[PDB]
């Protein structure tokens, strides 16, 4: 559980093992603090939501394509909590017409 | 950026050139935290909220005026940070209504 989180931190950020520290302290703390689930085991609301997202991104074609790949996941029978990865993707969606804040040396501000 | 935020603190208080260190330390903390703003980029969406706000304080003539000013603003310079300035101003707006209490006795409590 921990080992998993460490591997997420170290890998993406690269090996400081003391400069990936921040994320790791952050990670254990955030998951351990319990809350009761919201958007869970209601996959019908989630599919609809991603289709609206596509409609918004001016990609109507990608919404029918997505629906086809979605049904392909069901038959495999693996990945217990499908909704959680879908939920993640949607949060980080962005439209092809802007780009969100990128800056570095943010500590100085 | 260190210089710019320190000068920001000194200017607003109208004085204190190394006595605003404490306020500064706070400001460095807030900025170092992260946000997810509801509505991220895209010039149309912010202009629409500003007009509604103008109507609400009963300054109609100002809403119409601003829209010309927005097209003008663009023409004078084009950013990818245009939206962040317009949203910044939006949040930082002041209502004409009510007295803003006393500060001449509110300091003491």
């Amino acid at each position: 559980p921990n080992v998993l989180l460490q591997n997420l931190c170290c890998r993406i950020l690269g090996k400081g093992e003391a400069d990936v520290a921040q994320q790791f302290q952050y990670a254990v703390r955030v998951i351990g603090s319990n809350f009761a689930p919201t958007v869970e085991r209601d996959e019908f609301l989630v599919t609809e939501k991603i289709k609206k997202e596509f409609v918004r991104q001016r990609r109507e074609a990608d919404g029918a394509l997505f629906s086809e790949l979605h049904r392909k996941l069901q038959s495999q029978g693996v990945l217990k909590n499908r909704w959680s990865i879908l939920y993640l993707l949607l949060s980080l969606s962005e439209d092809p017409r802007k780009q969100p804040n990128k800056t570095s040396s943010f500590a100085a501000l | 950026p260190n210089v710019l935020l320190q000068n920001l603190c000194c200017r607003i208080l109208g004085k204190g050139e190394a006595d605003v260190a404490q306020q500064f330390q706070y400001a460095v903390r807030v900025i170092g935290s992260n946000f997810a703003p509801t509505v991220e980029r895209d010039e149309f969406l912010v202009t629409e909220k500003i007009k509604k706000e103008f109507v609400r304080q009963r300054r109609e003539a100002d809403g119409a005026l601003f829209s010309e000013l927005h097209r003008k603003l663009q023409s004078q310079g084009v950013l990818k940070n245009r939206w962040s300035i317009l949203y910044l101003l939006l949040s930082l707006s002041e209502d004409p209504r009510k007295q803003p209490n006393k500060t001449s006795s509110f300091a003491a409590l």
Binding site: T38, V39, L45, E48, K49, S91 | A36, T38
Partner: peptide, 24 residues
């Protein structure tokens, strides 16, 4: 009854956008 469903369906759409907003 169709006329009720129509209003129902609209309302659902506005609450979904708010749910995700309130979640953010």
């Amino acid at each position: 009854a169709i006329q009720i469903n129509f209003i129902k369906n609209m309302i659902e759409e506005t609450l979904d956008d708010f749910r995700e907003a309130c979640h953010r």
